[PDB]
PDB file of N, CA and C in Angstrom:
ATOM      1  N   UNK A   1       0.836  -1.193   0.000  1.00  0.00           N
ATOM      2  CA  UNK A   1       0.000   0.000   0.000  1.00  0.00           C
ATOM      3  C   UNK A   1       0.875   1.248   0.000  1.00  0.00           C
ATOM      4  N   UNK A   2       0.532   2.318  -0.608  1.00  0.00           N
ATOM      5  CA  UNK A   2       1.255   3.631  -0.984  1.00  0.00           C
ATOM      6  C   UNK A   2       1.259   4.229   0.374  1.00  0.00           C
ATOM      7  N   UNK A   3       1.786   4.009   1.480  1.00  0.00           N
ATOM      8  CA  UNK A   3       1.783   4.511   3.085  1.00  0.00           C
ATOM      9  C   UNK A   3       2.566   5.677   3.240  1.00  0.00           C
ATOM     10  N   UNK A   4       3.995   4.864   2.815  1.00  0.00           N
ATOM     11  CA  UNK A   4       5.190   5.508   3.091  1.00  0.00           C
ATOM     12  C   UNK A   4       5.517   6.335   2.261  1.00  0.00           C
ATOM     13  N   UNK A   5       5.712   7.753   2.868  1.00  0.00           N
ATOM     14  CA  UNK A   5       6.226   9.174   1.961  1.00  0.00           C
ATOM     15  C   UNK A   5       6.972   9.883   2.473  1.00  0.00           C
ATOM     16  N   UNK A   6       8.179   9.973   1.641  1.00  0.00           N
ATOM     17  CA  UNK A   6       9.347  11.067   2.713  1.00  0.00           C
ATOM     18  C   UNK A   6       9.402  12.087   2.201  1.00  0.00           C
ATOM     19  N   UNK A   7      10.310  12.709   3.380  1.00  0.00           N
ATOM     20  CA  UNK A   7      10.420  14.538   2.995  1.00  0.00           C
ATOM     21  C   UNK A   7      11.441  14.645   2.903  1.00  0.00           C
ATOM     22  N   UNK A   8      12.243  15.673   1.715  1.00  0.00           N
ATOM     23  CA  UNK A   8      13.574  15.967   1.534  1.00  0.00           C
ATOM     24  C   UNK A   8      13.866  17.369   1.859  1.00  0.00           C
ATOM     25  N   UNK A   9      14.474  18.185   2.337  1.00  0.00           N
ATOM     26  CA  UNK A   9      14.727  19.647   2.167  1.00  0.00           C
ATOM     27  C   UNK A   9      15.534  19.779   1.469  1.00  0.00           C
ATOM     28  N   UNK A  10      15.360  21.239   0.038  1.00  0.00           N
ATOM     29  CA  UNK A  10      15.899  20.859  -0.872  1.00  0.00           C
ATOM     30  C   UNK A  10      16.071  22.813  -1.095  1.00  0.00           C
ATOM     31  N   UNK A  11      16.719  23.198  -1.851  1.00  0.00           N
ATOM     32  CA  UNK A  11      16.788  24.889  -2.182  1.00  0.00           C
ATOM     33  C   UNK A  11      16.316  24.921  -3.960  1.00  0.00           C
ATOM     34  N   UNK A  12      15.016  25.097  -3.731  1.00  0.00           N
ATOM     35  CA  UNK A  12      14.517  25.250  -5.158  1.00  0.00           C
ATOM     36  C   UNK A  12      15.432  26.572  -5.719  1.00  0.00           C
ATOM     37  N   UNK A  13      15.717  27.784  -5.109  1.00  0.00           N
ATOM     38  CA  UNK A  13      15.955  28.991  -5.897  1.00  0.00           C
ATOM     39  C   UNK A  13      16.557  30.174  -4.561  1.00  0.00           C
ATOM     40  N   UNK A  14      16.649  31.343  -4.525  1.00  0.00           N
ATOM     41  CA  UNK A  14      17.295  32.426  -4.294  1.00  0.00           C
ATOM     42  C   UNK A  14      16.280  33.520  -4.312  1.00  0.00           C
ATOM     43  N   UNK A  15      16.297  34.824  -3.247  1.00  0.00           N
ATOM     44  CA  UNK A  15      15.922  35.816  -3.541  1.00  0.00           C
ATOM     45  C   UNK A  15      16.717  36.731  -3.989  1.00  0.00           C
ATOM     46  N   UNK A  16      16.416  37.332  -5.620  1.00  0.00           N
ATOM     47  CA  UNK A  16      16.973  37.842  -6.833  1.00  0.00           C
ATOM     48  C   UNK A  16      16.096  39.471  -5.870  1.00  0.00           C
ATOM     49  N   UNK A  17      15.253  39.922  -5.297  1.00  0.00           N
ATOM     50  CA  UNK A  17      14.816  41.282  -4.895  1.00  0.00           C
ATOM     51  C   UNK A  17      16.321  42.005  -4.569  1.00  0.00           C
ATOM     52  N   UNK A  18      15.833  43.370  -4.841  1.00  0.00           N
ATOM     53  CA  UNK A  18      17.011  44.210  -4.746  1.00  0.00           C
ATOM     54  C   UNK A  18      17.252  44.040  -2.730  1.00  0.00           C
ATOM     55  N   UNK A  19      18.185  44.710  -2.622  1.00  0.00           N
ATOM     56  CA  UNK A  19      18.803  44.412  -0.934  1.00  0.00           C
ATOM     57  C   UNK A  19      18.198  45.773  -0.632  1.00  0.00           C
ATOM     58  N   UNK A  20      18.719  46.216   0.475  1.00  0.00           N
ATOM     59  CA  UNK A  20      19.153  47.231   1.099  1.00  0.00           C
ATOM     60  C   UNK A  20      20.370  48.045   0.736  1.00  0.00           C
ATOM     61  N   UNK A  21      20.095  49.461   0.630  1.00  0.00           N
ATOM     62  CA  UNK A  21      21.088  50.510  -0.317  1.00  0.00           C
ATOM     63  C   UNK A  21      21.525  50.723   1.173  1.00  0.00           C
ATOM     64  N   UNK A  22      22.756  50.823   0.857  1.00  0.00           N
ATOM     65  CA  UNK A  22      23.217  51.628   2.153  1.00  0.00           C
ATOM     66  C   UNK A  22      24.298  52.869   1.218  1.00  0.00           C
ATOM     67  N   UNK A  23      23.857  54.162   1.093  1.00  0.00           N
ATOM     68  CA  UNK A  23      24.850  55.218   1.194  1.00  0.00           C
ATOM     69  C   UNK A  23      26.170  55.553   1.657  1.00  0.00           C
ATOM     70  N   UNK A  24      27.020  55.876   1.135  1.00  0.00           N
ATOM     71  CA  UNK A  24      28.256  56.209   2.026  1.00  0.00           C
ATOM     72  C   UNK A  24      29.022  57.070   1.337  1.00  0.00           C
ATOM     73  N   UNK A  25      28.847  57.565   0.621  1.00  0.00           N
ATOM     74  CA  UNK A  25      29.550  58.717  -0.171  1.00  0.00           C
ATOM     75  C   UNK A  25      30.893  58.216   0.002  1.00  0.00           C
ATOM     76  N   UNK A  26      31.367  56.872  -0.835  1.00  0.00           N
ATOM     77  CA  UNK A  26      32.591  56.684  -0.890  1.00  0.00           C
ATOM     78  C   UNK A  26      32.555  56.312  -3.099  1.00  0.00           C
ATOM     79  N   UNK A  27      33.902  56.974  -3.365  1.00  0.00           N
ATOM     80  CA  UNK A  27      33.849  56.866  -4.819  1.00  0.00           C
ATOM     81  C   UNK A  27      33.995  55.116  -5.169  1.00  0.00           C
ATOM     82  N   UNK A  28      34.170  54.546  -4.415  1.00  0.00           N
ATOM     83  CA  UNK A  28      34.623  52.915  -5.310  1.00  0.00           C
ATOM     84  C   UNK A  28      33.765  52.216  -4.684  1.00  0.00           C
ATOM     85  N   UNK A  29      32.210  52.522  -4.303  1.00  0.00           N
ATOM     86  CA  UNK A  29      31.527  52.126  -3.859  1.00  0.00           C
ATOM     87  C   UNK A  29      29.623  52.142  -4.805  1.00  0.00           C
ATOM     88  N   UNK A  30      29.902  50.781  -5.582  1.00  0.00           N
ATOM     89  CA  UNK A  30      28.937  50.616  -6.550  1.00  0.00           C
ATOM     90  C   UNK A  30      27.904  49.786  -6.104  1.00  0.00           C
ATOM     91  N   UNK A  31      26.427  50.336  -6.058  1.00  0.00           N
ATOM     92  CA  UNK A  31      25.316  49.245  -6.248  1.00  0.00           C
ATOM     93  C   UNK A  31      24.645  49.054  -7.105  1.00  0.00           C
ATOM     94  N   UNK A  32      23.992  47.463  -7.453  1.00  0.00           N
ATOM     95  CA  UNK A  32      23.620  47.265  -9.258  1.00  0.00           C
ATOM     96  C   UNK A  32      22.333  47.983  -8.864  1.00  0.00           C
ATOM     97  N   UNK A  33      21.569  48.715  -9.957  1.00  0.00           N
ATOM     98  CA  UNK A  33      20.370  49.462  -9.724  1.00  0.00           C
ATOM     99  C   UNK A  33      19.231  48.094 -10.313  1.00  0.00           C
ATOM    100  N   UNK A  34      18.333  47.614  -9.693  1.00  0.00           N
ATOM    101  CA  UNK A  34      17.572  46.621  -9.876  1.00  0.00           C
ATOM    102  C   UNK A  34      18.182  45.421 -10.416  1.00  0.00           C
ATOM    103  N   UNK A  35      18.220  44.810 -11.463  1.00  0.00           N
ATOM    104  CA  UNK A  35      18.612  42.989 -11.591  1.00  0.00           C
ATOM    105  C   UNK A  35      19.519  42.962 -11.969  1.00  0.00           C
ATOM    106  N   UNK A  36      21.077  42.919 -12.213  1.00  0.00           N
ATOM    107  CA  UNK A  36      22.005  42.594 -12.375  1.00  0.00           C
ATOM    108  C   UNK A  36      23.203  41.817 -11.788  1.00  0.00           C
ATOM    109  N   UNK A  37      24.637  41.756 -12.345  1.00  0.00           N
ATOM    110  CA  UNK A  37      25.099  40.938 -11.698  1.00  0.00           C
ATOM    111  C   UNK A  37      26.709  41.551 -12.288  1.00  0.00           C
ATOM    112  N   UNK A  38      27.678  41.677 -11.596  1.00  0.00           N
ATOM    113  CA  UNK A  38      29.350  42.072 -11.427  1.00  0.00           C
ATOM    114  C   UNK A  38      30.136  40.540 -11.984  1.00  0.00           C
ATOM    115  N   UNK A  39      30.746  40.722 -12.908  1.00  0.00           N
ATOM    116  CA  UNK A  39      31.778  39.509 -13.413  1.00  0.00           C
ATOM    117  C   UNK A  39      33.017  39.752 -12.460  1.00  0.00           C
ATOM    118  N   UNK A  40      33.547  38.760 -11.703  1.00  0.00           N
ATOM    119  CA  UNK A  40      34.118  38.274 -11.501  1.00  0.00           C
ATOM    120  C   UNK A  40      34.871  36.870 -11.437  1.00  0.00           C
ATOM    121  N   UNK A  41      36.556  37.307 -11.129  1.00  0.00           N
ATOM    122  CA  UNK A  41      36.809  35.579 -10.844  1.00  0.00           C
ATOM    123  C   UNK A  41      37.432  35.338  -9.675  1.00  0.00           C
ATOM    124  N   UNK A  42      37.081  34.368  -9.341  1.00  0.00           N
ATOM    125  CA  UNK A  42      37.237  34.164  -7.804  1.00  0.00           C
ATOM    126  C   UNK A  42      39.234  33.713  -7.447  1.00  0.00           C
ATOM    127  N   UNK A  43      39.607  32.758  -6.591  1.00  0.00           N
ATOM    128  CA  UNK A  43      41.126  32.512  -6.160  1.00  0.00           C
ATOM    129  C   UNK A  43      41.647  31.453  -7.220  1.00  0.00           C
ATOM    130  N   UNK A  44      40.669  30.373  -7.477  1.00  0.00           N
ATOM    131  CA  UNK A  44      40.988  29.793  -8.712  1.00  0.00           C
ATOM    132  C   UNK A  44      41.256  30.245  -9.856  1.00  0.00           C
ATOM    133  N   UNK A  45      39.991  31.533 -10.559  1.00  0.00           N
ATOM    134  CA  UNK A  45      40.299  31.414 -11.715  1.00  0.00           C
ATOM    135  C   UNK A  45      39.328  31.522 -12.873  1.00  0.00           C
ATOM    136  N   UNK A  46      38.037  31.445 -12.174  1.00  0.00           N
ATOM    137  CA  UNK A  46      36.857  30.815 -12.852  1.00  0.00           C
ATOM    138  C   UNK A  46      35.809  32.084 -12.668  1.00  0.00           C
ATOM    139  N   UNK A  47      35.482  32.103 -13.311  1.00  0.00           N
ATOM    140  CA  UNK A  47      34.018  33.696 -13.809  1.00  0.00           C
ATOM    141  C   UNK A  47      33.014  33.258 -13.008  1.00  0.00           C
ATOM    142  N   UNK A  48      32.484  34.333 -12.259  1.00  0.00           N
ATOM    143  CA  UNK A  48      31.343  33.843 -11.608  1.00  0.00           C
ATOM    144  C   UNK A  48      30.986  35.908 -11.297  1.00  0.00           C
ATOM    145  N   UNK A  49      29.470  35.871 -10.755  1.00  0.00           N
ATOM    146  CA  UNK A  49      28.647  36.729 -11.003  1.00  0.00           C
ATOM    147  C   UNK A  49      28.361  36.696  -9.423  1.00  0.00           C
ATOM    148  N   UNK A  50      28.710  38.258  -8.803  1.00  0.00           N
ATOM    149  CA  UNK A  50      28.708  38.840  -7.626  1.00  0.00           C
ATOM    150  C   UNK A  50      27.526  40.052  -7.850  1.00  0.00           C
TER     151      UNK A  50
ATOM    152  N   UNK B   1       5.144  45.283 -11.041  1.00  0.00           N
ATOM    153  CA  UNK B   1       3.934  46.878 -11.084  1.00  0.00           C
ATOM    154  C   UNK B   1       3.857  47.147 -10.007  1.00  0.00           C
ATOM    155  N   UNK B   2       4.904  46.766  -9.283  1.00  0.00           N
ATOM    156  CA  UNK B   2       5.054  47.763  -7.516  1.00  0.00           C
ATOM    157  C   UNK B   2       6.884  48.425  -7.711  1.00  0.00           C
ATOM    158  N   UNK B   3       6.512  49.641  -7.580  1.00  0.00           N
ATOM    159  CA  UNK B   3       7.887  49.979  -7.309  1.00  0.00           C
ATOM    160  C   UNK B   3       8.254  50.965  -6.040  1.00  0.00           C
ATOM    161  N   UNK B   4       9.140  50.454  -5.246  1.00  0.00           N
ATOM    162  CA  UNK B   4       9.654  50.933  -4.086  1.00  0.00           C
ATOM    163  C   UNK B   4      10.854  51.437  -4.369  1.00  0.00           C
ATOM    164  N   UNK B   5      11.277  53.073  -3.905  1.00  0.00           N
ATOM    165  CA  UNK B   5      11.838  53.740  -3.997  1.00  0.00           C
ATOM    166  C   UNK B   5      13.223  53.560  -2.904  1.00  0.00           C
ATOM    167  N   UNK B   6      14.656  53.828  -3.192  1.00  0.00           N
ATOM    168  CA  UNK B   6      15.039  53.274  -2.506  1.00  0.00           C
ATOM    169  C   UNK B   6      15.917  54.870  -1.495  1.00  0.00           C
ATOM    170  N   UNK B   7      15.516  56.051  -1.693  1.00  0.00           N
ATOM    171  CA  UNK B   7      15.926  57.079  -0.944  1.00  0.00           C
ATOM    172  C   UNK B   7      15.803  58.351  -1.722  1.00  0.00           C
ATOM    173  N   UNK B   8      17.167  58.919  -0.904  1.00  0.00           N
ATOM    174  CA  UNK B   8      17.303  60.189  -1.785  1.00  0.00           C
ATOM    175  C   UNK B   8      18.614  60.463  -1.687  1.00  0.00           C
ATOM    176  N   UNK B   9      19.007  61.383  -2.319  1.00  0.00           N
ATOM    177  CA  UNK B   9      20.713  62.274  -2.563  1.00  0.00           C
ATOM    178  C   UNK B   9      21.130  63.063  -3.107  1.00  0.00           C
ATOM    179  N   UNK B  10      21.950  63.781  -2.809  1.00  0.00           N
ATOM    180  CA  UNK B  10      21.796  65.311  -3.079  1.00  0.00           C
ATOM    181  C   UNK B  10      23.343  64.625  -4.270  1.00  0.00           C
ATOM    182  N   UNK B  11      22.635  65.029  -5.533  1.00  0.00           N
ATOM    183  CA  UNK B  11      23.480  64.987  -6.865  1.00  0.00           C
ATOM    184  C   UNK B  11      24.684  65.866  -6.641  1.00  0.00           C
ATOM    185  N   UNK B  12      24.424  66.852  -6.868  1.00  0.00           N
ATOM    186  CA  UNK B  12      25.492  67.790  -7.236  1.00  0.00           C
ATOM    187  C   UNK B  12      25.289  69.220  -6.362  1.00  0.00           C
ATOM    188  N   UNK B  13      26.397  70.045  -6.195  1.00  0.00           N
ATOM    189  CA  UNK B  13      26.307  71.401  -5.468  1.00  0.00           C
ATOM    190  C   UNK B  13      26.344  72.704  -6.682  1.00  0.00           C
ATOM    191  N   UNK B  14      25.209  73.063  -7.012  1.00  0.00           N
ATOM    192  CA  UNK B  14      25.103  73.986  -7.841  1.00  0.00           C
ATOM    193  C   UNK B  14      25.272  75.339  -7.196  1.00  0.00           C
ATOM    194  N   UNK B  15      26.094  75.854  -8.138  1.00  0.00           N
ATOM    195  CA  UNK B  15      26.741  77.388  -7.761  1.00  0.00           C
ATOM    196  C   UNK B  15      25.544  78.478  -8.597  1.00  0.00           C
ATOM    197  N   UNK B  16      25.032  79.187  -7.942  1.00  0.00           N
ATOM    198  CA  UNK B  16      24.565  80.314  -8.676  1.00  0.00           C
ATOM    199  C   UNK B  16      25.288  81.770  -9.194  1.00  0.00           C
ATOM    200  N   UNK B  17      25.834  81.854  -9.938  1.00  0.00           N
ATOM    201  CA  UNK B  17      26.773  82.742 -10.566  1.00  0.00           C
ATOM    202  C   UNK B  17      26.077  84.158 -10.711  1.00  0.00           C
ATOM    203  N   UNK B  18      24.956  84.481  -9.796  1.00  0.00           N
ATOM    204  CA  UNK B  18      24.621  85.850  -9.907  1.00  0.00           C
ATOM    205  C   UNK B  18      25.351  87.452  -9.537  1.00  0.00           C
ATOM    206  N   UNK B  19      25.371  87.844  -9.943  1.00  0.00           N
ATOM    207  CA  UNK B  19      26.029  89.135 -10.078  1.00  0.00           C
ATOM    208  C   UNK B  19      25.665  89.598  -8.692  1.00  0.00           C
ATOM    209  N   UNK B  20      26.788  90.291  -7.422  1.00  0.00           N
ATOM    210  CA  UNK B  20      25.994  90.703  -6.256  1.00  0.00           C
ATOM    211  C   UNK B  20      26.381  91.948  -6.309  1.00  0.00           C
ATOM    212  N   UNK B  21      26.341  92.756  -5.500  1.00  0.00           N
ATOM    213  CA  UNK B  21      26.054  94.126  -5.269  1.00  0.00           C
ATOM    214  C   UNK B  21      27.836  94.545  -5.193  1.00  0.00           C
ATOM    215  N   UNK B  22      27.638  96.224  -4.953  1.00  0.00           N
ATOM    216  CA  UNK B  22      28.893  97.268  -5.186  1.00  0.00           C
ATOM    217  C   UNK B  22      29.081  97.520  -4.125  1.00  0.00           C
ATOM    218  N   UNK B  23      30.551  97.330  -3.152  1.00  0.00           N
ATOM    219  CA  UNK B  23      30.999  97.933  -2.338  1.00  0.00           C
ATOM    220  C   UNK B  23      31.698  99.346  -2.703  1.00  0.00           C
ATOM    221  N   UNK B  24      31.369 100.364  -2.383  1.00  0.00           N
ATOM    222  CA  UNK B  24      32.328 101.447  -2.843  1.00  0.00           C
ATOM    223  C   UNK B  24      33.538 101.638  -1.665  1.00  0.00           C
ATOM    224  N   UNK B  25      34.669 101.509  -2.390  1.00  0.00           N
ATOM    225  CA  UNK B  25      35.769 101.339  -1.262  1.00  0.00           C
ATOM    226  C   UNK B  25      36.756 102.544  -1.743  1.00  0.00           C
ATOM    227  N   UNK B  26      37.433 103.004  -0.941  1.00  0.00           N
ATOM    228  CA  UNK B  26      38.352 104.712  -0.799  1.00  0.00           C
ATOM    229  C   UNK B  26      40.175 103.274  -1.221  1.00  0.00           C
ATOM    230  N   UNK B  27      39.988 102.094  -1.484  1.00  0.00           N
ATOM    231  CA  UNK B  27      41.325 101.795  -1.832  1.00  0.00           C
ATOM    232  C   UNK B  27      41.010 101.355  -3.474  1.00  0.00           C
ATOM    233  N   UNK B  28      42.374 102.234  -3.738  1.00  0.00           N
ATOM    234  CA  UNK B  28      42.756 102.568  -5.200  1.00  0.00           C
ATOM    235  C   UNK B  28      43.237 101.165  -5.865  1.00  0.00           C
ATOM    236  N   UNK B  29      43.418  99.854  -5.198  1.00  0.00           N
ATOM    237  CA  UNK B  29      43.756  98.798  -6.003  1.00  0.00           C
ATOM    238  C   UNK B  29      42.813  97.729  -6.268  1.00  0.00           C
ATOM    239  N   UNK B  30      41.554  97.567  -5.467  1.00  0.00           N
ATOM    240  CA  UNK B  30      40.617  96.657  -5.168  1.00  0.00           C
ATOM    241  C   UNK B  30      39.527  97.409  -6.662  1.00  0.00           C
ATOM    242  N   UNK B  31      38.996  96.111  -7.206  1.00  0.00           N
ATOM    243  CA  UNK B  31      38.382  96.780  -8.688  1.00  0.00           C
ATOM    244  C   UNK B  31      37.402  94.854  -8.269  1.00  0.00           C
ATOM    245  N   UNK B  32      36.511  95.274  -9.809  1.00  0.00           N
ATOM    246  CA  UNK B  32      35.398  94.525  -9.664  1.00  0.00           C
ATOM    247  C   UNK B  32      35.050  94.609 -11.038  1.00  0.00           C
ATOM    248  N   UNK B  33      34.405  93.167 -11.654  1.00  0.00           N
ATOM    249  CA  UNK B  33      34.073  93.147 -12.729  1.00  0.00           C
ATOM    250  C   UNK B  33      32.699  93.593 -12.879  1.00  0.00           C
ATOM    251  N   UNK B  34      32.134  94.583 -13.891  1.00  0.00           N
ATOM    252  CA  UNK B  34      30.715  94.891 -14.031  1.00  0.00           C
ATOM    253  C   UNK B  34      30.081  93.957 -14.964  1.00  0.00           C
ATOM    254  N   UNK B  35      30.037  93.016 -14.986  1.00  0.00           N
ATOM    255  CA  UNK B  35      28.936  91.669 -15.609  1.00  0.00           C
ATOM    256  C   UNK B  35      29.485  90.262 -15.815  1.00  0.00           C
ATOM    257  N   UNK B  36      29.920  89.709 -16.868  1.00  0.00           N
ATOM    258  CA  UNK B  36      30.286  88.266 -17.150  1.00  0.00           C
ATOM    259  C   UNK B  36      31.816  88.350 -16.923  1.00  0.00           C
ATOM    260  N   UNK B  37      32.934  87.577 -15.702  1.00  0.00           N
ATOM    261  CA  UNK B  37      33.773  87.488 -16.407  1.00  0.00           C
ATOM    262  C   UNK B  37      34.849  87.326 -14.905  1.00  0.00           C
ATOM    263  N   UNK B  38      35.780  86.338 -15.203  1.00  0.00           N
ATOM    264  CA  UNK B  38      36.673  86.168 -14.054  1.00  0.00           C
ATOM    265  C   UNK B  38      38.092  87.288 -14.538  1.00  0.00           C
ATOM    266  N   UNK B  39      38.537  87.644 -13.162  1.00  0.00           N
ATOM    267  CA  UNK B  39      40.452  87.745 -13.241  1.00  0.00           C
ATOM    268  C   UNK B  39      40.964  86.760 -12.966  1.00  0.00           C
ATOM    269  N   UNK B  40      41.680  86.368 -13.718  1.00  0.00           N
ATOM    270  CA  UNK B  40      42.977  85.688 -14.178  1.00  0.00           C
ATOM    271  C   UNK B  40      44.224  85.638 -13.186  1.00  0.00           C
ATOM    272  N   UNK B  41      44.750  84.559 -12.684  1.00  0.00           N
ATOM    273  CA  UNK B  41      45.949  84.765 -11.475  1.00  0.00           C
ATOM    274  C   UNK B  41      46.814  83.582 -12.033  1.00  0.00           C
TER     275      UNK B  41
END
């Protein structure tokens, strides 16, 4: 009989909403304005999106 | 179709370049331009 049913916890996805702006009147200090994403590469080597 | 605003900030410091008034002064080296126009140093 179909009794037995398990539960997995699993991370379907991410909240993509903009954050919290914090101000600071410093010049090398950038926030993406709504959905975007900063190329970077990390200690390896490899492109990834900050 | 909801948009939340995220502050405010003051852009830029705008100078108003208006012409101000005449001191009349008794020293013979102090001068003043009468309309558009800087001295040069």
């Amino acid at each position: 009989h179909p009794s037995r049913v398990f539960s997995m916890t699993e991370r379907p996805g991410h909240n993509f909403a903009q954050g919290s702006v914090i101000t600071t009147g410093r010049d090398l200090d950038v926030t993406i304005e709504g959905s975007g994403w900063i190329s970077v590469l990390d200690h390896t080597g490899k492109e990834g999106l900050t | 179709g909801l948009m939340l605003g995220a502050g405010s900030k003051v852009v830029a410091t705008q100078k108003v370049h208006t012409h101000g008034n005449a001191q009349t002064t008794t020293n013979a080296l102090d001068m003043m331009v009468e309309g558009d126009g800087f001295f040069q140093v």
